[model samples]
Target: RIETDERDSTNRASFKCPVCSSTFTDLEANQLFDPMTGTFRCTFCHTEVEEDESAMPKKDAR
Candidate 1:
């Protein structure tokens, strides 16, 4: 896919998978904004991979 949606040219951004040829939107690629509260969700997948803090052990409490 690797295609960028012009609609998300504002605060959010996304890219498509060129390999799978699947169109992945920015909202679909939600990133962990706040880990202390637990974040790792994709805008589309909306699947929480893990807590933000868990991503980096030495990255403070956040």
Candidate 2:
């Protein structure tokens, strides 16, 4: 019998809030990510930060 951890399935990364300086995860950022403006709203300080392509996860395997 094998026991699998459910939390292990999620691939998340740590992100720092610029204003509040709070540590958050990519999953949390996704909820606040604005596609139109390409910015992430900080949960703590409610400040908007420009989305950096380098900070985002790369799915390409080429």
Candidate 3:
């Protein structure tokens, strides 16, 4: 499954693919996000995502 997070103040968002446990940024999403399917193609797993939703986290304070 895939998941997305709300954009921060910088207008940068993040996406995560559980298959690969990899995280992608807004810039990366630009290349992987498929508007037609409303999903993101996992860069590491190379899997075509079919659905996704919001995630919650704020660990990167530094």
Give the higher-lDDT candidate: 1 or 2: 2
Tell me, by lDDT, which candidate is best.
Answer: 3
| Candidate 1 residue runs with Cα over 4 Å from true position | 1-12, 31-62
Which 10-residue window in model 3 sums to the lowest lDDT?
Answer: 49-58
Worst 10 residues of 1 by lDDT: 50-59
Descending-TM-score candidate ranking: 3, 2, 1
lDDT sort, best first: 3, 2, 1
Q: Write the residue-wise lDDT of candidate 2 on 1-62 in tens digits.
A: 88544443244455556676665666777787778777677776877754333454454464
Runs in model 3 deviating more than 4 A are 1-12, 48-62
RMSD of each: 15.3, 9.1, 9.3
- Residue 58, model 2, lDDT: 50
Pairs of colliding residues, candidate 1:
1-17, 1-18, 2-16, 2-17, 27-43, 28-43, 28-44, 30-42, 30-43
TM-score attained by model 1: 0.27
Mind giving the per-residue lDDT tens digits that candidate 3 earns over 1-62? 66645553344456677776666767777798877777778877877633233443555564
lDDT of 1 by residue, 1-62 (tens): 78543442343333433233334444544543346655334334444332221222242545
Clashes of 1: 9
Residue pairs in collision within model 3: none
Best by TM-score: 3
Q: What is the Cα-based TM-score of model 2?
A: 0.47
